[PDB]
Design a protein around this ligand. Sequence first.
Ligand SMILES: *[C@@H]1O[C@H](CO)[C@@H](O[C@@H]2O[C@H](CO)[C@@H](O)[C@H](O)[C@@H]2O)[C@H](O)[C@H]1NC(C)=O
Ligand SMILES: *[C@@H]1O[C@H](CO)[C@@H](O)[C@H](O)[C@H]1NC(C)=O
Ligand SMILES: [Mg+2]
Ligand SMILES: [Mg+2]
Ligand SMILES: [Mg+2]
Ligand SMILES: [Mg+2]
Ligand SMILES: [Mg+2]
Ligand SMILES: [Mg+2]
Length: 575
Amino acid sequence: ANTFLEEVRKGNLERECVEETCSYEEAFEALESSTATDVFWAKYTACETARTPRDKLAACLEGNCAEGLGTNYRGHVNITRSGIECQLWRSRYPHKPEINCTTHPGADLQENFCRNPDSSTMGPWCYTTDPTVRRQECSIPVCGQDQVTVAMTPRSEGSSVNLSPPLEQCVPDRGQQYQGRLAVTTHGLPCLAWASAQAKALSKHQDFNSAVQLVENFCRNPDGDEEGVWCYVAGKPGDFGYCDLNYCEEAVEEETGDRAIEGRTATSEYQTFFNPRTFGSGEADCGLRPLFEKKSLEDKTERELLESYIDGRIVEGSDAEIGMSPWQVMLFRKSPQELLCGASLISDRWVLTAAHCLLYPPWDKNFTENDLLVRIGKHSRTRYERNIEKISMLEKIYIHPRYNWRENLDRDIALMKLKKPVAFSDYIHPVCLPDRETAASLLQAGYKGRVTGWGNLKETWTCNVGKGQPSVLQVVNLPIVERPVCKDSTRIRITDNMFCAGYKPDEGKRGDACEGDSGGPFVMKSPFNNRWYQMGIVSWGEGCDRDGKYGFYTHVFRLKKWIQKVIDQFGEYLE
Ligand SMILES: *[C@@H]1O[C@H](CO)[C@@H](O[C@@H]2O[C@H](CO)[C@@H](O)[C@H](O)[C@@H]2O)[C@H](O)[C@H]1NC(C)=O
Ligand SMILES: *[C@@H]1O[C@H](CO)[C@@H](O)[C@H](O)[C@H]1NC(C)=O
Ligand SMILES: [Mg+2]
Ligand SMILES: [Mg+2]
Ligand SMILES: [Mg+2]
Ligand SMILES: [Mg+2]
Ligand SMILES: [Mg+2]
Ligand SMILES: [Mg+2]
């Protein structure tokens, strides 16, 4: 095609095993090729149920139809039978495919269509972008005949005569101002009674600014938590539960209601709000790096932190600076070894990463407490540094109620505890804490964000050829992205418990709007008080897989009181 000699051969061949029959050695005569020989075979025997006529045959090997089943089919359709888009033929989000990128070159499993290189027990399928379902078949005509192999299902969103119909109007103040009768939660669980047998005798040393009455057995929020209401449950002695419900669009960026200059004069001012014996340390002393904040030493990228400094360019992966986040933490598997996820640090005894990292069945995984291990304050991922870095075990799997992997990583969050605690050092030092009221005032002004890692985020999700992971950590700053802007980027609907965070992107590239460690850190530094206030965990983003999208990481500002409760509960399973 397109020329003389590559064309020339075409004619000879339209006639050989098409209308007549042919062979290996017959093919190997007029062919003049070694490997190309088998480009044929895939589609040929795929169309086993038609040797003659060429008329009926026509569509099969052209590759826009299903003969019998459709191993001839290489055709191009974005979607599957129902509606929610197919997955690519290499990226592993949401469900991991069993067929990874190296295995089948026969079908040439690239792009995002529907394939069947392997003997399906129903028909030609592709993986979905919905988590509820792993794979499904798709709807193509017969080869040389008009007949869809499978039916469609549309699925839709209505209003005042399709749904039921409902229309509420929202709950203000994030759970305080509510009096309701509900007793159903996320998994499908109940409440327990506030003045019966187990909702008074342990309400012992806690902040009860009690305006609302103690009524019966519903979900409430009298403390003043900024998430919402919750009530109690029971099992292998453990958790309570936030009752799942629709809320307002009360964002933290610019709350409406009634270039600037620099300041410093202060060394620690904060709200001592947490219980240092069972909870322990990390509350006052945090985010004041041993090698930087304390000496008043900067790093290369503090000078540049403003939104309007040099009016927008793109930045590359930099071989990063030593010990400048001594709160960095790894994650691995027992027998055998395996690099799993990224994380983040706060105290001598408490820990964090993003909740995807274990309880996600599509990769077959109830890896309970003891499948696991950690290494801390590291640098050269290829090496071990023994002294500077250290080793401690992890405790138990504390489930956050609102985490929904089946849905769409909505509240991608949980908690754990260190087994043996750890000491404060040059190489070892935690990061600091902004509440809602801190978080809000911060983000109106023009400043930047930061994430780091060994490209473990960049690693885990796709195949990604050539670009081998950096054994040293990677660093680079990032800008803010407005809420008026971010929406129309993607047509799939968006949440206010996550955020857009990436550069102004380009056409022909994968991009670095997606870096660091998965479950890794989304950190910052205060000009108020010189502390290091974090504002997210490094979770998945469209930018990783989907070209020309943004670096995407999780919110933090709401749940001040979730763990305020937990810290007294830690001690109750002891001895
Ligand atoms: C399949 O998904 C494609 C992504 O590779 C989409 O391609 C884009 O489509 C827009 C128009 O909607 C173009 O302007 C843009 O240049 C790009 O090609 C596309 O929506 C979709 N294709 C089909 C056939 O549905
Ligand atoms: C994992 O399996 C164990 C026993 O096989 C079970 O008791 C436990 O409930 C599971 N994990 C979680 C978090 O439910
Ligand atoms: Mg012919
Ligand atoms: Mg011969
Ligand atoms: Mg021959
Ligand atoms: Mg011949
Ligand atoms: Mg011949
Ligand atoms: Mg020839």
